[PDB]
Structures are given as structure tokens and as C-alpha cells.
Amino acid sequence: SGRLVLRPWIRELILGSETPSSPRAGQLLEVLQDAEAAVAGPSHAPDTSDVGATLLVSDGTHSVRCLVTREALDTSDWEEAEFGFRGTEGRLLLLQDCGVHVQVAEGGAPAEFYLQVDRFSLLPTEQPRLRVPGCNQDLDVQKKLYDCLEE
Secondary structure, X not given: OOOOOOOOOHHHHHHOOOOOOOOEEEEEEXXXXXXXXXXXXXXXXXXXXXXXXXXXXXXXXXXXXXXXOHHHHHXXXXXXXXXXXXXXXXXXXXXXXEEEEEEOOEOOEOOEEEEEEEEEEEEEEXXXXXXXXXXXXXXXXXXXXXXXXXX
């Protein structure tokens, strides 16, 4: 009887000149770097609890790299969910609190826009993952990138 649909928002957000007042839904395509929960007590096992998750998130039209901040990870309750993002690819993901940031060129990779997520929720919806260009491949985004760099 129809299907409910999410509006694309990534390109519009970056090109738009203010921070998002509203929460945005997007699909998790890939986990580039996953996160580990903070385990109290001294131990010889490595501690990576000071590092957030890094995801590739799609909106149906473009993808974007998202840095899920430690603050966002530690404030979420992981109810019936192993801590971290692997296994959840293809899931919908609600970015409730986030901002557009510029990453300058570094370690062989050119500059780009990316999102920093300070609050999020997984929705239960899972769905096929579709090939999608990066938002940084867009011409209007590229132009705005090089505007931002010059400052």
C-alpha cells in the first residue's frame, strides 16, 4: 500500500549555510573504523576507548564519512546490541546531533567534507545497500570545499 521514503539531505546540508536544526536519517553503508567500549581497570590489552567510530553513510543519493564521536558512543544505551557498528551495515541510522566539518589533505588523501556525529540512534529498519557516489564528487560541493579551505 505504498512505501515510506527518506528525503536526501547530504548535498543540501553541506551547501546550505547553517547547521542542521533537524535530525537526519541515513543508511550505514560501511564501517571504516569500528569502536570498542571503555573497559575500566588497568590491563595489558590495548585501550582504544578514546577513539570514535568512523562510518560511510548514504542518504539514497550520496555517501559521506561520519565520525561518531566518543561522546555519542558512550551516551547511547546499547540495548540488545553488541557495542559497536559491525554487523549493522545496511541499517538505518538517525543522526540527531551533528555538524559539517572540513578535513584538510593528509596522509595521501585530498581534502573533503565530513560529518561529525555527537548523538545518534539506530533504527531497526534494514535494507539493501546501493552504490552511491560520494558527496565530495559533486561539483558544487567541490567548489564550496575550496571556498572553505581559503580562510
